[PDB]
Model the fold of this input.
Amino acid sequence: RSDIEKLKEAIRDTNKAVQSVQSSIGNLIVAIKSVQDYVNKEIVPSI
Amino acid sequence: RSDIEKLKEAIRDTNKAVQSVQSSIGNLIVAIKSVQDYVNKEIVPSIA
Amino acid sequence: RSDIEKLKEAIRDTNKAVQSVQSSIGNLIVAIKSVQDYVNKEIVPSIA
Amino acid sequence: DXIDISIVLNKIKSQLEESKEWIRRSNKILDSI
Amino acid sequence: VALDXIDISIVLNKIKSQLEESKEWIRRSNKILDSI
Amino acid sequence: LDXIDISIVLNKIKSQLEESKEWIRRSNKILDSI
Done:
């Protein structure tokens, strides 16, 4: 209940928000790499 | 002026930075989806 | 050492974590642009 | 879909919503100071 | 023929501007911390 | 074997993502010491 404890918990929640963002970026890599792979495997041979 | 008030506002600014990053990632989804849609609409019907 | 000094350094490290995320998003833009440019330059002329 | 990235994009949106709520909880705590 | 089949310039520019707003907030945070 | 070759940039993103994770770990470790 102390102000120090509250600031501590606030930072903890901020860090969890950053961890969620970190997970979202990891999946963004997957999304972009999936687009890359489809183009290279299914489209590029046609041209 | 207190170190407690300094810490509090520092976290609020950091939180604002995270929110801007959240908006950036939402727009990265749109950019990727735009590439996906063009490929499926304009290119795929000719090769598959 | 002090609790205030610990809180400060904790926020400092969180800010550096955000800065790394910021750099990663700048490179995600590079990746998307590379896919976009290849499709536009090497594939689009064939289908449109 | 040709390219189907619906699963991964849906996961990204879901993780962003969780991120937004952690920031909401953080500001809510700072408000009690 | 015309530059950019796929044109995502506007959204990519928005992402860049939001990233710069984010960098600005981190500066404002580090500024405060340096005074502690 | 990758027309489009973004392996270099995708690995750089992973590297920067790893650094972000380490900074968060350090932050939580400092908080845990309180």
Observations:
- Chains E and D do not touch (no CB pair under 8 Å).
- Chain E is about 70% helix and 0% strand.
- Helices of chain E lie at 9-34.
- The two ends of chain E are 58 Å apart (CA to CA).
